[PDB]
Amino acid sequence: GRVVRLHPVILASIVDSYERRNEGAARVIGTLLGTVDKHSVEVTNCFSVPHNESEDEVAVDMEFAKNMYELHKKVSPNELILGWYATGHDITEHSVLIHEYYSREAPNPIHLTVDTSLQNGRMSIKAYVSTLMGVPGRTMGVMFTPLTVKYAYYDTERIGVDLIMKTCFXXXXXXXXXXXXXXXXXXXXXXXXXXXXXXXXXXXXXXXXXXXXXXXXXXXXXXXXXXXXXXX
Amino acid sequence: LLAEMLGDLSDSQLKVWMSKYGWSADEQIFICXXXXXXXXXXXXXXXXX
Amino acid sequence: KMLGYFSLVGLLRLHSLLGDYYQAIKVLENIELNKKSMYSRVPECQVTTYYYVGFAYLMMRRYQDAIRVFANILLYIQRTKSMFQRTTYKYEMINKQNEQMHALLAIALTMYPMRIDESIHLQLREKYGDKMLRMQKGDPQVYEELFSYSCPKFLSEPFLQQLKVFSDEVQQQAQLSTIRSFLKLYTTMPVAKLAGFLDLTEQEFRIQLLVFKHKMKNLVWTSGISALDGEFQSXXXXXXXXXXXXXXXXXXXXXXXX
């Protein structure tokens, strides 16, 4: 595959999925639909998945994938299950393993990261397919290949987007705030366990020089600190 | 101590220098948000990226 | 005008060798001229200018200005601890002169920051590495001995440097830094602990005097000194934190850009 196009609806669907939970720390995961039968993968729809992560391990609801996809097929068989997305903003340690799960539904698996925080203006999307360059005299090692993205729309959506940008051209939230306050009233122990985690990540990287795992741990610690600051 | 440091002055001479710099004896000679939040948001975003 | 600038620099150097410090400084102040003419004419001239600037800085109390001029003439370790690598274009004799200048700069360089770098410098020589170790030790007895043994290096004209004045001045500054390095941070400190640490300093009576003297310098702050008890007492934070966060982001940027 040479490149990926993404419909504006998919971007907005990923953001809407993330928005409802109202968790900055949380990263949401779902399915993408479209057409991957050419050198240009066209991403044209999506749906959210129930998803939970504990430690390294993560749970995806297989039955949910099958049952929702079956309803999607009844609406429009042209939009095939071609991969998955998450809100990132970056590749995570578990992604190659999660990707192996989606491979069962279809192959090759395609991963769309949609940066719903939108830190970088140029891209709200990073696209990857899993492949291994390989090492001579050694077994091949899996890795993500980064594919270029563009945002493109069929006429219906173009019309829709233009119409939406014309003028330019709470209880759950309270509960979340309460949870943040509780975290603040506890953060002295969570600090000391994020200090340890940070050290762990460093250890992993050292071993690699495992490395990926350590890096992930470090990132998690940083995220936890950022969420503590935001709460404050 | 001050009188010693000034060259072993009499109490009268010491008084001249205390007077000159306004020093007086006590017990002794008396001698003497929103922006931040925004910054964090940016920093966080950068880290995430 | 590059030739004229060279004449000024040479004349100033001659005056310094046989000449008064202030006039030479004034000449140096006139002296600087566009880089580019010097770059086009020869590699060496720029290095010579950098050396002159370093010498002026050394004469000057601040070691900062000389630290920059010397690094440009020769590669120097950067803030954020990244290697600065110089061009080898200049003629080999000129390069040797530049290396000598770099060796001289170490003296300015140590004052500028940190810490134990001699990587560019040859490992084998104990002349500079030994000096670095002695500074690290924080004990004069080794430092004094280092001057005593490498008395010959300092001497290299004899009238021009009759008394070793600069080296002695530098050493006395160097001795003070370690004490400030404890840098208080204690609300209230036992006298005996201070006495034990100040005892190491050559004057026994310095702590009664040496400690008060340090307060006058203001490098380190002492609270309750001269007290009847005799025991020393010892938004902004947010700004500091923000600063650190900025540095972290900068490091990440360089990583991403790379």
Binding site: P8, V49, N67, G160, D162, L163, M165 | - | -
Partner: protein, 170 residues
């Protein structure tokens, strides 16, 4: 009264109607959201499958229950606040559509009926309206629909032709 329609809700309704138009079969779905004050927020929608049956009895409660349960694993978890359809006849041509609304109103008296026209909707002109039944009188009335978009959504939409805590606080 005002119906606030979200970005994904509006795009899905236009998409579905147009897809329905190619089909030549009328397209309906459910609107999900929140009754706030008098005002109603439509945050999302989903399509109902085409049925041989016309208007009422179109709805498939097995499909709906499955879809609602699977969304709930999904974050939004929003009440059915009404329904949308694409109906060609104008203006107010068909009696049958209204009765459907009476069924929705009996389930929840606040329910809203949205109607979109995918043929007459053109660049610069979305043809859409929102209705409720009145409580010689006419049977129903129309409330203007506004659009709500987040700053994040605005940036996202601008990639066409490119050349959470906050929301909670609000």
């Amino acid at each position: 009264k005002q119906v606030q329609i979200d970005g994904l809700v509006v795009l899905k309704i236009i998409k579905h109607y147009q897809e329905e138009g190619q089909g030549t079969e009328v397209v309906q779905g459910v609107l999900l959201g929140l009754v706030v004050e008098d005002r109603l927020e439509i945050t999302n929608c989903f399509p109902f499958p085409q049925h041989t049956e016309d208007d009422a009895d179109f709805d498939e409660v097995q499909y709906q229950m499955e879809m609602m349960r699977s969304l709930r694993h999904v974050n939004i978890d929003h009440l059915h606040v009404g329904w949308y359809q694409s109906t060609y006849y104008g203006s107010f041509v068909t009696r049958a559509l209204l009765d459907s609304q009476f069924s929705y109103q009996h389930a929840i008296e606040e329910s809203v009926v949205l109607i979109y026209d995918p043929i007459k909707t053109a660049q610069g002109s979305l043809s859409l309206k929102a209705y409720r039944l009145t409580p010689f009188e006419y049977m129903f009335e129309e409330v203007p629909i506004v659009i709500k978009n987040s700053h994040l959504i605005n940036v996202l939409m601008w990639e066409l032709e490119k050349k959470x805590x906050x929301x909670x606080x609000x």
